[model samples]
Each structure stands twice: as structure tokens, then as C-alpha cells.
Target: KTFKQRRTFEQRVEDVRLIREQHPTKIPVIIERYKGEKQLPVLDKTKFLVPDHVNMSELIKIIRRRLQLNANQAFFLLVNGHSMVSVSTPISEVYESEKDEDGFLYMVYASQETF
Candidate 1:
């Protein structure tokens, strides 16, 4: 005969809390404008602080509004010079997997064409 052990309700809650603490709650994102891309005054601030759970699509919208880009303009976000992070990807996953040795995720933004 064998007995199965189960965690109490409180224990499960504590486990969840510990797991949450193990992951970062915020990530730092560095934005760079590719050469030949139109320069915007808002792009002057290259670094931004975002919640780890923020999605790429939301980020694009945020950048577009901050830069005041018109509807006709196109914005492309690329990571590590090659891979294009999907709009639905979480920022934390990208940061954890692809950030540079310095712990900063570098993203290049271009208008109209890929860099």
C-alpha cells in the first residue's frame, strides 16, 4: 500500500508567492533607431522601464503614441539583429532568453524597411 501526500491550501499559496518572487517583475528595454530611419524627438529617450508581462504588441503601440507616428508610418522591432519578436511574445521571456551579457535587451526600431 502507498500513501500520497498533498500540500495544504496555505502551503500552495506560499509556493505560488515564492515562484512569483523568483521572477523579475520589471525589465529594462533599450531602443535604438536604425540608420536611415526617420528620427523623432521622442526617440531621444532610448531606455524604457516596462512590466515583465508586457506584450510586444502593447509595446509597439506605446512607442507609436509616444513618438507621435502617423498611421502611414511603419514600425518594426527586431531583437539580436535578426529575430523579430512576435507581437504576442512576453517581454520577460525575451529578456531572459536574449538579453545581452549586461542584462539589457537591445531592440532596433525602423520605419518602412528591415534593418
Candidate 2:
């Protein structure tokens, strides 16, 4: 089957807007484990899920400074594993983790808004 093409700029704009609204923006977040716990018996290619140590906090600070985002405009999120972790998970899935190959897991973070 085939679909019709957008005939006007307004229609194209509306289509793009809808697509943007339907898609969830995501960014890669690297977790720097605290107290050298990163090498613990955790999954490979993943970092331990723990409180924001100096490194993690520093990362956030750097983001804020680089992006010029205020405290109120910033937030943190931790997402583990690529399974079920897509652009659809709600805020509740922030820190959720799933084991993968080599017991490795990925953490996701909801940083400050991007301009």
C-alpha cells in the first residue's frame, strides 16, 4: 500500500509536530559508580546503581554549566538495560534495570531540558 504526500507546508508542519509529540527524546547517560564500586559484581558494560557520588554529581554539574540550565530546570534519571527501555517508558521507569549479556546494564537519566 502507498500513502499520499503532504501537499502544503502547514500539513507538513502538522505532521512533523505530531511525530515530535509522539516520539520521546532520549540521550545516553553514563553512570560513574561511587567508591570504586563500578567494578563490583555488576553487569559488564554497565555501572552500579547507587547514590550520585562526586563523579555523578560532577557530570550533572558539567551538563548544567555547559547547557546553562538552572537547578529547577534539571532532573536526573537512571535506566538500565535496553530491553523494555524505549522512548515510551514513563518517569517511573527512570531507575529500572534489566540484566543483559555479561550481566551488563545501562542507566538512563532525564537531564535538564535541551534548548
Candidate 3:
């Protein structure tokens, strides 16, 4: 005899609820400047609360404005040391995979030449 698997309405509802609950709308990230670079002003605090929906390109623009960087200046944002993060990458994915034990995703910004 073969058995068929089925989910009750209540079970399906519960699964949807769990899925929604597990999804985070915002994530905490820590942006750290490369230790060797001194051109940019040091940030008073490395912590930032970013919406999960924002892409890296938008994030970079926000950072540039916050840092008062000129449009001509070039920088690189990296995650997990060697993983050069792209402009279209979602912030939440990086946070989920690279967050430290303290629950903060650590990202590094370096001068274009530093890489």
C-alpha cells in the first residue's frame, strides 16, 4: 500500500506564519574602514541598521553621503575578506552568512588601490 502525504489547512497556516516570522525586515551591519587607510574620516560608530530590501549600490550612495566622500573617489566594499560584494547584492544575504557571534555583519571598506 502507498501512503499519500497531506497538509491540513491549520498546518499550512502554521507554516506560513513560521516563514513570515523567520524573515527579518531589518538587519544590523557593522561597516569598518580598512585599518591602513586614513584618507576618510573615521566613523564614530560602526553600527548601522539597514533595511533588508536595500541593495549594495543604494547602500554605497548612502555611505558616500554620510562620509562626505566626493563623487570621484573610489572605494571597495568587501564581505568575508575576499568576497568582493557587488552593487546589486542584497544586504540581508550578507548579514545572514557573515554576521559575527555578536549578531553584527562585519563589512570592510577599502580604497580602490588597497584591494
Ranking by lDDT: 1, 3, 2
The whole-model C-alpha lDDT of candidate 1 against the native structure comes to: 0.68
The candidate with the higher lDDT, 2 or 3, is 3
Compose the digit string of candidate 3's lDDT tens values, residues 38-97.
Answer: 677666666577888888789878888878889788777776566544678788776667
TM-score of each: 0.70, 0.26, 0.69
Supply candidate 2's per-residue lDDT for 60: 48
lDDT of 1 by residue, 1-115 (tens): 1001244546545543554566447566667777666654437576577788888889889889987989987788788666564778898887778776545577777765547
Query: In model 1, where do residues sit more than 4 Å from their true spots?
Result: 1-24, 39-42
* Superior candidate under TM-score, 1 versus 2: 1
Give the range where candidate 1 is weakest over 10 consecutive residues by summed lDDT: 1-10
- Each model's lDDT comes to 0.68, 0.35, 0.66
Best model number under lDDT? 1
lDDT string for model 2 (27-69, tens) is 2233322222322222133222223223334444554464455
